[PDB]
């Protein structure tokens, strides 16, 4: 629904010319949570704004729910905004009204509905998980829900498109874990299509379908999440427990480690697992079938981008043929095997 082509915005000091965004083309499929993640302080900031034209793109055309924005017609613009809603960095709630109050705020500005105001709002509070219990307090409430109050406001317009701007980064991880699911939940239910911009990868793995990687105003990679192994920005690929299994392993573990094989020792393996099924009885399976022993150095799994990823680093003992035999056995069944060294 939301399509971007050549979105270039340049910032003018007067004396100075600064590149904001240079030629970014972004295709976001309706019914999806789209992630634009990128370096800290890289202009991710302007881009979200260009979508509802808070910021004016010097070049390019933005299309939302099939409509393009030319800054010349303000009235036209006012109309589309009801369809694309927005969320914030910090909670951005209003002190003056209680929780029931902020949500109705947008309904009032044009629609002026005498009573849907209770209907959309209450349904939203129930939807958000905050309503029956804390309907009463305005500005001060525990920090995680503080956000929900805003989301309901965003959904108040019952718009096709909802935007995000690092909302979870601010909240402590427990709250962060929660906000992302509420987003999936309003998603499953309303068919809400969403565009997400975030500081960290974990924000991306729980709910990003497609993710874009942005560095210094240009768009580096765009792909479905499972796929995103592309051009050399692993670092972010790395923030997920890839910063524990891979770069860390046990740390003074390596002096034990040899670059080359030597007399009477075992080959350490990176076992990388595919969108396999859950049963994966593979490691166990090898011991019973091949007489092999697994000492596992390290491992993890998660549901990210829709398919299970399973990674393990494990010393694998056995006869010289039996261990070679096992790697192949695993290979037919879709197990990627890599050897770092021998210990």
């Amino acid at each position: 629904m939301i399509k971007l082509s050549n979105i270039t915005k340049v910032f003018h000091q007067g004396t100075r010319t600064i590149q904001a965004l240079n030629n970014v083309s972004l295709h976001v499929p309706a019914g999806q949570i789209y992630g634009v993640i990128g370096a800290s302080g890289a202009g991710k900031s302007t881009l979200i704004r260009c979508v509802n034209l808070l910021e004016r793109p010097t070049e390019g055309s933005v299309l939302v729910d099939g409509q393009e924005l030319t800054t010349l017609s303000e009235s036209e613009l006012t109309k589309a905004r009801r369809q694309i809603g927005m969320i914030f960095q910090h909670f951005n709630l209003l002190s003056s009204r209680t929780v029931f109050g902020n949500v109705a705020l947008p309904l009032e500005l044009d629609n002026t509905p005498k009573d849907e105001v209770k209907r959309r709002v209450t349904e939203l509070l129930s939807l958000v998980g905050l309503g029956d219990k804390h309907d009463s307090y305005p500005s001060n409430l525990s920090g995680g829900q503080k956000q929900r109050v805003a989301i309901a406001r965003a959904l108040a317009s019952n718009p096709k498109v909802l935007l995000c701007d690092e909302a979870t980064s601010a909240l402590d991880p427990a709250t962060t874990r929660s906000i992302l699911e509420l987003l999936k939940d309003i998603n499953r239910r309303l068919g809400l299509t969403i565009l997400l911009i975030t500081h960290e990868m974990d924000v991306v793995k729980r709910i990003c379908d497609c993710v874009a990687v942005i560095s210094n105003g240009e768009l580096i990679e765009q792909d479905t999440v499972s796929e995103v192994f592309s051009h050399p920005k692993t670092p972010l690929a790395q923030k997920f427990i890839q910063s524990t299994l891979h770069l860390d392993i046990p740390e003074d573990y390596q002096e034990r480690l040899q670059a080359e094989p030597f007399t009477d020792c075992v080959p350490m393996l990176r076992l990388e697992f595919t969108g396999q099924s859950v049963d994966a009885p593979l490691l166990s399976e090898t011991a019973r079938r091949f007489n092999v022993n697994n000492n596992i150095i390290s491992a993890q799994m998660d549901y990210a981008g829709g398919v299970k990823f399973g990674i393990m680093l494990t010393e694998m003992h056995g006869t010289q043929q039996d261990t070679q035999a096992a790697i192949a056995w695993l290979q037919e069944h879709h197990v990627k095997v890599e050897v770092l060294g021998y210990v």
Partner: protein, 203 residues
């Protein structure tokens, strides 16, 4: 005695007059918040260079001397340059620059562009968004207005001491030359609660 009740009344009348001047003329230079020109709606051409500076010099200026100089204007504006009813006018002006900044800061203390980002939310063009601002602005404006009156009341005590009558007038006439322990001693106590009442009225 007979005097004290009338003097308190006169001092309150200074507040009564104060509401017209406190915001009808101060607020207009509360337009300075618009004049900052980093967006903040409108603000073309650098008005801000001296609208804030002039307000500041008036603020800079010392009470009593303001009213005395102001007399040329006071004598012309209302029939007697020396009336208490008349003194409310010279009074309105001293209060104005001082109060006008009160307008800018109360507005700036409040929670930034995010609210402004509500523009993205609802249609909220120009009028509509103005309507988002007031709600937040009042707890700021009134808490602000509250402190404007007490300093302002103290300012009236000077008028009694001179240009006009007031609870100051009796304190002055009875205290300034007479030195009545009986009335003056009570004039201070009387004022002290008079100001506290202005603070409670704030809640």
């Amino acid at each position: 005695m007979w005097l004290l009740v009338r003097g308190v009344w006169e001092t309150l009348a200074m507040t009564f007059v104060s509401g017209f001047f406190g915001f009808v003329i101060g607020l207009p230079v509360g337009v300075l918040l618009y004049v900052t020109r980093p967006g903040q709606i409108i603000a073309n051409a650098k008005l801000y260079r001296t609208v804030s500076a002039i307000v500041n010099i008036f603020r800079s200026i010392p009470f009593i001397i303001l009213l005395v100089w102001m007399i040329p204007f006071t004598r012309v504006i209302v029939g007697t340059s020396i009336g208490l009813q008349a003194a409310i006018v010279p009074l309105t002006v001293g209060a104005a620059p001082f109060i006008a900044r009160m307008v800018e800061n109360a507005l700036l203390e409040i929670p930034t562009g995010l609210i402004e980002a509500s523009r993205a939310m609802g249609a909220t063009p120009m009028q509509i968004v103005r309507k988002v601002l007031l709600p937040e602005a009042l707890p700021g404006l009134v808490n602000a207005a509250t402190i404007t009156l007490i300093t302002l009341v103290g300012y009236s005590a000077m008028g009694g001491a001179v240009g006009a009558g007031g609870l100051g007038q009796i304190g002055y006439q009875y205290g300034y030359i007479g030195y009545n322990a009986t009335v003056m001693n009570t004039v201070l106590v009387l004022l002290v609660i008079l100001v506290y009442l202005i603070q409670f009225a704030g809640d």
